[model samples]
Target: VQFSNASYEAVIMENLALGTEIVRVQAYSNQITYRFDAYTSAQAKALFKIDAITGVITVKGLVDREKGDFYTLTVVADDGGVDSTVKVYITVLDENDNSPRFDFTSDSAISVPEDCPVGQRVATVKARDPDAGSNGQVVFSLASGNIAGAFEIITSNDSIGEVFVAKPLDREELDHYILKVVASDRGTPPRKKDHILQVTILDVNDNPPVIESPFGYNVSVNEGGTSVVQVRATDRDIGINSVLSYYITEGNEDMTFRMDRISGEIATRPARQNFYHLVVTVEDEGTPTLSATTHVYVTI
Candidate 1:
């Protein structure tokens, strides 16, 4: 009988052991020969031949693959009954397509502003494979190594689109974090890829300087005449940058205020204060670029 429907798919030219036992075989009408090994039932030994009258024949060894993919046998009967033997062909198929892989194997980082709101977006990630369509598409999720579930990662569609901050960020609470990200495919059981994310939080300036004293000033004028009083200025920028500088930004001749660059003192042009309105300013060279100002009254 012919092999099962898929017999043609079996290994090519390889030895095949028939699972079942042969019942009846032709003697004079049946003849079997194999380029490879051939075995069969007890009745059929080295060679199998069918009986001319009974048409009974049997085979004795296994089919050898070394001969070739296709097998041929010749059959002849003494009774003048003749027929051609059929040819059997076999083919082999491959298994285990390929191993899953990641698009990037190194670590990545995400930086968030210190003042970033609670629901602000953090970053995004992605992965790929050499397999087929969906089999190549990746999914995103947090793996291990994350503590107390600090960060959250999500994928938009099938690929990693964005990572989000699930909770508010506090530098004092946690300066940095390391997250484990898992990227999986859409294949049968699905293959997995892993990556690391190092997140750093930046700082912001929310502190302002507070002046110690509300105001500082004094006035005096010479008898005959032209007299003046200088106004003093100060700031918290520290060093020369914070040193206060005074000038008669707004005042009349009698109340004009002039600054002694080195002394940081403001004196009236006429030597005496005649009710002067002077604007003193302080500045700093520090990063944030700071400045402050205060007004002073002069009496002669």
Candidate 2:
């Protein structure tokens, strides 16, 4: 009249697709189809549907066991008012479906002082894995972008990755850099989230101003004039540190020779002496400002 076994069990993955026949209940002696009894569990009723004529149960919703701890499904089939009940248990396997994500994205400018100490930690790779057990932990590593060979990232054995200065930095030589780091979960086929780090070397007041041409220049003029030599200087610094100001520091006793404060041009202003020996200096605006000197001889 009915099947020998009164109970059945069904197993499936958490993210099983809809209309997948998970399990089937059969009536051995009779030809009546099966249906779920007044569902004992709310989530189980939403998780699956049973075919009344074929006695087959198909998936309906995303039944994740981790999200909902559901268990049994009671079944019933009535053939012309004769009712039969059976027990059904569902077991949904937990699977890793989520990948790791970096807590922070590319910030573009990660400034660090030049000549930073080797092994100094400049950045950290922070990521999170939205999974459990096997895939819950996240690991980090360096993928690329260290072409300058100035930095290094940690390995997978470390829980988190660290960015450290591997080579000394000189802003005058190389000022900008890019590094890429990868974070992955411990899944079978690892899902990766990457971080693109933009590193910029900050300028240090480490260089002194160097006069472009340091040799003495001799000039002879019959008439008094302001048109004279233009002595220039340069510094290996950036922006504010490299701003140079010109001065006739040592030679202008009576301020007879005019050296442009902004420009390095030396101009004459009708002096008492027929011959003048000038010491022109160029100084930068760096902290503890640095300077260089040169000579200019004028006979009028």
Candidate 3:
């Protein structure tokens, strides 16, 4: 008669208390005495112990499913050299022990234009967990630094985090934003990780040139003498948008006055008119040109 079953399978819950009885094997026969043989797996033997007389198996110490989820062992029963071996399969149920972690490295800087439209894709962030089933499923959310409802995080088809613009962007109001993306798993007492994303809003030529000084100038000149006046203006834009050129737009009917394009300085030559009114236009070299006008009055 066989001392133990030919094959056995058992399921053990993870994180069981030490010395918990997992399973038991029985063998009884008349005219033969049963003796337990050595376990086949050294790793399994270290974690589990079998009673020599009772054939009962119990946990030796701690059993974490993450370390080893499945274990297989062989139990042999010998009756005066006539032995019977049985394979024991043990599956450890999983527990929510590991938190989700970001798979990608943190980006130091990400650039987008100020005119970026809503729902524009900014970046993709991926995270993963070592646990199984729902414990390993990851979800994403925005933790902070939305910047006036300007950005949001969405889950992609593959369950990765996708950062996108939620509203229109304006560099004049906000130029940069620091976002915190929280990645969490669908486990009990959900674990999370915070990822920092640096976003830079690139400038666009959206503002017009402004005439700040020399709105109107009055100067007197003799018949043969010269008079000079300076016009000043500024632009709120950067780069090429701030570069300004000055031109006399109106009131130079006799061509007696000349203006410098770069310096905004106007000089008068010999003129017949005693009074002159000039309109100076300052324009920036930006797309969809923006210009501002200022008036100048002269007396001779």
Candidate 4:
């Protein structure tokens, strides 16, 4: 008697139901009676079983590919005194059972200036999975909202996710944005993970100074009057950009009038002219400084 097949290779998915038939063996014999025997370890015997007459191999218990992926078994067919042996190789295939996860534990937040240029790298997001191959591969996407058109997600080296600014950011329009990023795997019925990202747009000195005071000032001046009129201006920016200085740009060529640089107060000396028109300029101390002019009319 001899076995019809010398070797057999079978593949089964991980975590298959118990009693599932994995493979079948056959033997050629002259007589009608035959017996089958499995020469395997005690641990392997507990997980697998074979029929003595039919030579059918079946799973006995649960099989996890994580613990063990391959199983080898030696089967013997006996007819009277002669015996035949065959090797069986069982391979357990992997499944997409694990979901993708973000590397960050807490809230992911980033700070960027409002003047940040387009296509600037704002932050980087990383995700991981325990499975191998396509089951573990992760792809990133942004949720739908007002910020969707303002930013984009970039995949680097075909794995890491990078967030970039797609449009200009203005602090006056919006200060912060709460974005949801989703990480998914490339598998059948893909698994996904959500991560909250908080982005704060810092203010920059982009706005120029604005004269909040009236555009025109009118006053009656007596000869040699020491009385003064105060001019006011304000800048929307912060720090040095908010610091304003006042100067008399026009109609002060004769030094007939003077202005206090810090206080923006204008004083006039005795003048023979009946009417005098002066142009005052207010400037802010910022990069590429900005200025505004207002007319001051004095009637004598």
Candidate 5:
């Protein structure tokens, strides 16, 4: 017997035998009504044991649980030999205990430069344990690799976090490296899963500064040695390597035209009117080395 509100005041029943008489069934709040009926002769078989008042049902034959997942039955009752019936269906529910599986059955790859900047994330290892609670709290780690100790993993509420490269990524020497990562869940004694992390160090052309565009400017001298046209050069290296500094390569060494090492500025000490070609060069502080040169034309 199932109570409508735990008050035992109302009940809904199914799978009861047909041809049975329901006596003294209860009702509540006028929202529902109790039923009991059994049809007569020819109609009796059609109605079988179906409840007429509430539509609850009972079948005349035995329930075959193996026949299928669910069974349909009809309920009826007889009071004072009068019969009435109703139909009700029964459905079975399945269990839920299947283990969680990975959305992608393969390992993911991450690419980072050997000179990868500090605090930069390389890759993320994703895994899922379908179980609840501690069984789903996944912990990620770098199992092995040359950069094994160089990197660390961070876990979050979901499969989101970064593999930070503690060191820089210098691709010129060691191009690429393969790292193995393991993701484990705190399932009781703890269950672990492993994946392959292929880390490729991409080259970012950290080859230092090189003077690609070098040119000289010419200007007519007025007065003793006035300021003339300025010379400019470009460097490709990033950071300090890209920071440019200029030096007088040839031409006037008697301080005819002063060169600003920081600003690459060129000017004459005493204002003068004369045309001169000042040779200048640019250099960068890279590992191996880098330099470039150009001539400046000064005319009156």
Candidate 6:
């Protein structure tokens, strides 16, 4: 008996269960008694089993496509009197055995000014899958931490994700964000990877100093008086932007009275200065400084 063909070709999915039959080789000679030749690679031989009587090939072990994609088996079909050898070409089909993985840059954590404009690009994310076709296609999504939908993701590219500021940022309102992102592959039972992104909103000099009404400017302050009159002011900004300094910008022509720059306290010198109109001003130490002026009428 001799083989039907000099060679046989078939495809099988990786990781098929044991005894899962692949294509059977035919030779009236085939099952005449089919068996692997001594020359078949031992490494390839262990992955399969063949029935000597039926010429049926079946999976015997794990066939991970990631490790190997093809296997070749040498089979001999024979009667003791005559024999024929044929090459069994087994192609291992790929499965979605691998999950998507995120690739983060060292600068994954980012900072942006509170005044950063809308539609500005803030971050980029990348995820990759090695599987073939749809199994390897990865898409990104916003998992969490996008408050009020302030940020949006651009998924036009299959492998790259871009994040943009969709709304205005106010450090005074919201200080920072931890954007949770997930990457998923388009597989039958999809696989996913998650990533955490940090975004810090830097403060800007936006608020001006708001001078709180001090010692009833509608009330009176007399010259050469022992009582100290102080003007307390407030600023909404933080850090140096919130720091306040007070000055008697007007009605201090004679220098009869002096005001503390830091404490906003006004004390008088020994002079007969009565009925004075004081214009008190408060300023904050912020870039593009802001100041407010209020009139303080006093009886000297």
Q: Which candidate achieves the best lDDT against the true structure? A: 6
Q: Residues 24-67, candidate 4, lDDT per residue (tens digit)? A: 87878544233334457666677778887788888887777766
Return the TM-score for candidate 5, rounded to 2 decimals: 0.39
Which pairs of residues collide in model 6?
A: 27-30, 274-300, 275-300
User: Which is the winner by TM-score between candidate 1 and candidate 6?
Assistant: 6
Candidate topping TM-score: 6
**What alpha-carbon RMSD in Å does predicted model 4 have with respect to the real structure?**
4.9
Candidates sorted by lDDT, descending order? 6, 3, 4, 2, 5, 1
Candidate 2 per-residue lDDT, tens place, 145-233, comes to 77668888764442567788998889998888877778788788777887788888899888888877657578875655467788877
lDDT at 208 for candidate 2?
85
Mark the 10 consecutive residues where model 2 has the least summed lDDT: 100-109
Better of 3 and 4 by TM-score: 3
Q: In model 3, where do residues sit more than 4 Å from their true spots? A: 1-9, 30-43, 105-108, 213-228, 269-271
Evaluate model 5: give its lDDT: 0.56
> Once model 1 is optimally superposed onto the true structure by TM-score, how far is the C-alpha of residue 48 displaced, in angstroms?
28
For each candidate, what TM-score against the reference?
0.39, 0.69, 0.84, 0.74, 0.39, 0.86
lDDT tens string, model 3, 1-300? 474566778898888888898877666553343333464667787788777767778888678888899988777654554466667788999888888778755343699999988888888888888888888888988889887889888876425888889999988888999888898888887888888888999878888878776446777766432547888788888888788999998999888888888888888754477798999998998887899888888887
Query: In model 6, what lDDT does residue 185 have?
Result: 92
RMSD of each: 12.9, 4.8, 3.3, 4.9, 14.6, 3.0
lDDT for each residue of candidate 5 in 1-300, tens digit (9 for 90 to 100): 222332211122333455544322323332444443232344324433544465344445432222233433333333433233344334422222222333474347766655767888777656776555665667777778845366777877745446888766665556666666677777667777667777776545356444444334646665445666555666554556567778878777556788888777777776333656677777766554566777778775
Per-residue error for 198 in candidate 6, Å, reads 2.4
| 185-233 per-residue lDDT for model 1 (tens digits) | 7777777867888888764432223333467444544332233544444
lDDT of 2: 0.78
Each prediction's Cα lDDT score?
Answer: 0.49, 0.78, 0.79, 0.79, 0.56, 0.82
Model 6 worst lDDT run, 10 consecutive residues: 214-223
Better model by lDDT, 1 or 3?
Answer: 3
Query: Where does candidate 4 clash, by residue pair?
Result: none
